[PDB]
Symmetry: C3
Subunit: 656 residues, 3 copies
Amino acid sequence: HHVHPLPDSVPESEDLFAPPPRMQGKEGRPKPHIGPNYESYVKEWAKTVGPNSDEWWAAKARETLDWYDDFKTVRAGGFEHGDVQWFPEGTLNAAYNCLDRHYYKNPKKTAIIYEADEPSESREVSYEELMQETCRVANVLKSYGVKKGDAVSIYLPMTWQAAAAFLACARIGAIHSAVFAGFSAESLRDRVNDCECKVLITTDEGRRGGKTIATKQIVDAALQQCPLVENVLVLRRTGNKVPMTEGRDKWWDEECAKMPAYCPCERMASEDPLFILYTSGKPKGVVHSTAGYLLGTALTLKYVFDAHPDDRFACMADIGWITGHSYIIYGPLANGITTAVFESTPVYPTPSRYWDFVDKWKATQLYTAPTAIRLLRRMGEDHVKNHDLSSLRVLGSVGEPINPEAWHWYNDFAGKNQCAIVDTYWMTETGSISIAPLPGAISTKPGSATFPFFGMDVDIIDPQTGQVLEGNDVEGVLVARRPWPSIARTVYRDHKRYLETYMKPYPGYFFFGDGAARDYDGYMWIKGRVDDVINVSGHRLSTAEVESALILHKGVAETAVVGCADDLTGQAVYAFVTMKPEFDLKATKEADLSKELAIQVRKVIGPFAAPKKIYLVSDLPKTRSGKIMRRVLRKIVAGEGIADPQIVEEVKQKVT
Amino acid sequence: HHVHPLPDSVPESEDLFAPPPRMQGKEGRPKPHIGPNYESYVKEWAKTVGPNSDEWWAAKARETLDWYDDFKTVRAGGFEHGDVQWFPEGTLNAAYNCLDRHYYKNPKKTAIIYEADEPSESREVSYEELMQETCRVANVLKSYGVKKGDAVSIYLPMTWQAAAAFLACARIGAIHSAVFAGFSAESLRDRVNDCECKVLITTDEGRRGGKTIATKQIVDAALQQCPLVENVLVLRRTGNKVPMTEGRDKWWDEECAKMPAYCPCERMASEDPLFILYTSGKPKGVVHSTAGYLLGTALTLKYVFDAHPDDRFACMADIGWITGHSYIIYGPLANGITTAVFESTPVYPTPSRYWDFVDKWKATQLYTAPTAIRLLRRMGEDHVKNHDLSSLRVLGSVGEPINPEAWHWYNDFAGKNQCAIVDTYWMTETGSISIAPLPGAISTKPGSATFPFFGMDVDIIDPQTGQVLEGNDVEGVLVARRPWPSIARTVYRDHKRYLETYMKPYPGYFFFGDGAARDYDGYMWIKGRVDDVINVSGHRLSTAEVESALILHKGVAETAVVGCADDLTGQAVYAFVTMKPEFDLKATKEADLSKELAIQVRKVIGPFAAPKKIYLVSDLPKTRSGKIMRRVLRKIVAGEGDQLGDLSSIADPQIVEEVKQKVT
Amino acid sequence: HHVHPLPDSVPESEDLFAPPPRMQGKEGRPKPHIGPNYESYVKEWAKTVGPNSDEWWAAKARETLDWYDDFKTVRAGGFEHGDVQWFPEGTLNAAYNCLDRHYYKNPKKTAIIYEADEPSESREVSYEELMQETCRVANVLKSYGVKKGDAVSIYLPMTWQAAAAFLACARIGAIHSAVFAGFSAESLRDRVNDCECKVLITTDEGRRGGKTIATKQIVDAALQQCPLVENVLVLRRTGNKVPMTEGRDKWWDEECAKMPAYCPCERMASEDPLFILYTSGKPKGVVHSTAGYLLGTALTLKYVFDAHPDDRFACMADIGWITGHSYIIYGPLANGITTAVFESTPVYPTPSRYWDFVDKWKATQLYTAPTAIRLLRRMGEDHVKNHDLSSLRVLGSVGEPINPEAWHWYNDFAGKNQCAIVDTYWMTETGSISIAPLPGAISTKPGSATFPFFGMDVDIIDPQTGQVLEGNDVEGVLVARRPWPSIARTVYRDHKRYLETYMKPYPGYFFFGDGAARDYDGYMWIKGRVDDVINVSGHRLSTAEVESALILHKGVAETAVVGCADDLTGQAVYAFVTMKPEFDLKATKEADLSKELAIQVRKVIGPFAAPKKIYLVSDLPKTRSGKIMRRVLRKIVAGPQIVEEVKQKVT
Ligand SMILES: Nc1ncnc2c1ncn2[C@@H]1O[C@H](COP(=O)(O)OC2CC2)[C@@H](O)[C@H]1O
Ligand SMILES: Nc1ncnc2c1ncn2[C@@H]1O[C@H](COP(=O)(O)OC2CC2)[C@@H](O)[C@H]1O
């Protein structure tokens, strides 16, 4: 076979992990909605794609959501000009489907488990409390003149009120634009100005990992260049002395005390914009409609994680990420279950924090990024070994390919080999999970996204010819043939960039921008960004298979390989390797470590995949979501031309 | 028994007035919807409360109102945090339920009987005319940029166009804030600024009691401190020269002439705010939603007054009062009947005006306040005795406890002992009538509100312990157990004050602020405000029983007793008595009359209730709705005159100076 | 008989044209919705009028349109106070019924045949393309802050994007106010200021008949006196170097490139205003609601022209005219057929342009004005004789009474005596066609509108007594007894003028302002405006019969007769006659020609109708819609370059 699984230390015959007993309906656990085998997944999946799927999507839309006005058409439009339409005639409100309809049925059921930065301050927020807080904020926004269609910037840390600020905007038909708390004043400025918002919601200070986020300090600097912002709502999170501008700035609690605890729901057309979300050139504000996005997040959350009514979904991401949008707030609350708002880091107070949380609340699912798993892997298994963690049934990975080493560490310790691992592939532009194994039906492989989700008709294209590589054992670029409900509708006031980025390069398709491969079993392998691909002497090297090989060597915590122009091979491979903090870098020779890694790569991939130069760095350039910034490293090693900015100075200094 | 009826001259066994013949389906009168006995009221009432009442309330809302979008949930929310919800998902429009759907069935039926200040200028306003006037005003407001959710101030006298200005706001989804015509410039300013309205509706002048109300003069003075008001629509009521500011002020007739006579109805969510109404500390803007309030006003009117399609309802109150909101405009027009807009006073041209009106239009119900009833008692029965008044079937009282003396004068002369008397207890914050006898089912008692209305689950609480006084013959503070559709939703931009006033003092309940008593027959007695109670040597005195005792003495027209701290008795009783203007002044010594009143109180209540000092004054401090301002007298008779409020919009503000001068 | 047909050279017994074979269901043509005789038209019409007609109107509204929310009441209000209501409770969107529901059914079906000024640049615009363009413009408007109820001025030539600009406004609930491209800056200014619009849509330049319309040049002059206009969207139609005002003016293509190709449809109540249209004293902004107007245009287009799904409707009018509003955009697109946007004149490149167009696209109906018919009649029959034109089934005339001479030229050459001729009478204030023959059921007469459309119960009133002239063979002023769905709802911010013009003069009726006559056959004859009537010695002379008489004399191309105060006859007749440019007036003495025309009128009408003085002019004062401006001539004999010529001759 030509397409090979990501390098792993386990033999392939022992590397097929079928759904465990917890995902089989045993141990008193809920039977999965999809099961018990791969055919059972395809039987349902094939109903959701092709030109005969309209009846299926219409039925699901009416089952999943509560509509004020029914729709007549199911789908319309296409990629060509960016006129995607789903359920155009229907009306609904997101805050109603995420709050009201569950409050009316069981008001005391916990909507949010608020895990505070300090574990002792954690508490449960019922649907009643969240609904009342949401309605108060909505009335405050109306009193500020916020109208349906106006943009509202949210600059909030991971306190539970962030969901109230999200859903308050959705309740009145406003368009919220959430920005990671802790972004620089310049980054926040650009996103406030691009959405042309007149109202901004923030805190006095944020608390993550025992560190203070000077939110109001940053907002003041940014708004010195944001003339359109007239009202700033400041949530009193810490109570520390922070500057306040009289007239413009008002306290969250004081404003909400003047407002009623109920607010009517604005009846939104399906294609009314629900939110703007800028991704970390110019800031790209991905715009999502209402009904399609909500339906997508609801069904993926229900099917990709096998959600059941009493479950407690624990997504540890930040709401500044689409993962937080879709699988902390909208997805979980749409289905009417409990969701987790994690305010701290995975290592505060100690690297046992994740597992202290899981056993404290009896979390039934855990959702996080590969970068977090690698962080916990390099801290020691003592922090996980002595935990129960039996409430869990599904563990999810999102943001990047998951190295088989991290995959196993996730599977072995967090799941105790009794949880299904769902490597969920998707994008901010996809709205909901696009490719992931259904935990109760699909047998997994370390690092494989497996098979596409409902409504996702994906294929592999030759990047040069542009034609479909039919069959298995093929490698190329991933594309989608048909629109899906939760697909992004535009880029805010830059629809030209929306079409040129995803619709022009391969006409007739959606262009994810990812290299993909379909091995001989039909499993989809998403091996990294197309821009990250390295072509050594006519050999397409993907960063996932190379980095997966490097982590197989003892002591390695994280790696990142980029491409640079080479005299002989056209393009050569350069590697950045982060060793575990408890490595004896003095005992193992630096040059010897490079040779050991080089031979390691040669053994599992091929002679061509060996790095030509290796760089030792304390950490890698990373976004706030956890993605490795390979483009940044690539330009640095080329001479032409976000979590910890100090890594940039270290990388360029080590370049010489 | 411990709980005793309000002082009356009739024994209790001869003081129970069963439903009269007119309310029995006889004398060619419509058979009541509820009857014939008390059991028939309980059988239906029990469907409206308890955990099985959604089935009843859902049916009534859908049968009573026309909805643009149906609702899914019946009720939700509660008192605790002030998130009351009724029919959340439904959409509707008030102006549609009060105008359009009746215009479509019989456009020529009289919607408003306009009783002008001068009787000769009275005329009938059909539903067609009222709808066209409303749609024109709505289009004028739309042309001013008024959007759904915007506030509009109404400063209009009791001319028939006032209903058009109300329903025009409701038609476009705006929130009208009506202020009594004649309020001082300072009082109007504060209410115009508090609702943050940008448009003001007013007249050039108002006409009541043959005197000119310089409305536009007052509006001009107030608007120098109301910067948010950009457009003022002036109704030409008298036509006298009044200042007009070009651009800001434009004439009603001219503006409406540029607009079509139909306007689309904004589809309002059930919980969208319908109106703000400031009640006479800081101005308290009581906010009401749409569907709950509309349903409440409609059902109370249909059941408390036994409304039938052809009836002609005559509420003489002013639209600046919640009684006018609910039982002049919204209540009556929703039910599709005729309602009265009375522009004059009860004594202009003469104290026979009320009864001339009833016999001219053949009014079938009359609704007014005790202050007006006592006033007519004090003018002479020659002005009422020689009237027919046989069209009437139900007489209503609202605003304060009804004195057994006034109740009888109401029953004897206005009704000729052939009308059922409905003592309707409620508040601006309740939206619709809370406690009242159903005329065709309940036998009344002088001064008793009798039994609570549908959807009202009320109880008696000990004000200290906070526990329910179960059973009969109990006395305490009135509370409600469950929300009711028409309950106020908030105080405009002061939801904290809303919760602290009605929801915090007795958590889990609504606190009316009224002392109440449930006698041994189950009848409820609302004996006055809790703030007005006087505790003489640990004995709780309610202002109703004391003033009812005083009114039992011949010659008494009106009284008002307040409390003052006493060294020995803790609190002592002080009385303010307004005797008829033609009493034996100078002939009967002031000191001689004071002793007679004190002994009368000692004879019917007890020695502790005897006033220690009595003050004779020409009138009492009163609001424009007719409530006696006992807080003013209490603070004045306690040396707190410097700490009084904005007593400028009082019915007669000069009476305040008389009380403080009469300090000794 | 007292009521006589308009002067024609054909005998009356040879002047009744029954539905031709193409309109009878033969030759592979669709069965007409109404047929085959007059009784079939009356049988259906009686359901649409009277106090039991709600059942019919409810069914049509629900079958014809797609509603977001259903209605309960059918009709309400009346003429008295101007509170007409139709389907008050229902919601819908015009852009949805004209674009979305057809895009969802067949996106590639051609919505607009765009006939460019140069024939070689013509192309088909599919429903998909038109919908995408509309949604982009709608999103551009929303980004400008345009809200439901805001007015938007449209100053666009006859390029296909004009429909996109119309429907974009309708999509978001805005009220579009279209103004003829080429109107002076003063006329544009007055109409822009009266609607208080915040946004204006125009082109850099327009092209009609090979000439440049400096649209943006005119806009600049007008906006120097239009304070409320903040944003101007300029469509690059020609691309010529034109001034642009930074900030205020932005390009259509550039703005639309920033927007998605879909936009949600605003859910409009039936009586929400759809558009303002000023008619060419002070400018009169006629306002139309949504559901009534849309339903009216749909049914008249379906029945007056016997529209069928695959038909290709060719209305050559301009969208600045109500004919363009109702029977270029709304009518056809609502019914989901193909419509024509004709950008040129009927004589560019040659007077065969109309007929070259018909055979190129195989148009199934043609709709135009008498002013266009008369122009081509005087250009030579060689340009029409040698064309196929067999795709046509119905030819329509609109704007003014159709002279029997032009009527025959229409039927003889353009129709080849195989098309039904529909003389459609209505006004901007009626919304849709009021009186017209149903082509598959009614036998026509040259110059007669025949019978009123469904829902139109019209009558004749004696202009003096004010009483109804019941029966046939009656002549007077035309009025309507009951409101009809598409009736105009008001005049923008002048409901007083609206009531005084149409509702006050004859209370209880709608006053069209036209002299009318109902002959012994029940046929209705619209003989001209009441203001144009001439009372010679107590004889009511209508301009149609007098001008029809003048056109019966050979060499006459167009005429216009006005009234004059006379000492003896009370009112005297003055005639303005336009002879063909290739007439040798130098050979024929002026006085000789006048006597021949004067006697001609004496022969066909009577001695009293003879003009007292006849004036020879190259052309007549005309609007852009084609109506003859008789008021101009009337005051001229008392105390666009044609005005200078007319005043000099009478001296
Ligand atoms: N399961 C996965 N396997 C391999 N690669 C993955 C996977 N999930 C994400 N990615 C990478 O992250 C981008 C998305 O990031 P984004 O923040 O836009 O959306 C985030 C996902 C919510 C993908 O385009 C790709 O490059
Ligand atoms: N039948 C009654 N018996 C005894 N007291 C009554 C009665 N009606 C009103 N009140 C007093 O008036 C306040 C409300 O006045 P408001 O103007 O807000 O509402 C007015 C009533 C529409 C009550 O709280 C109470 O103190």
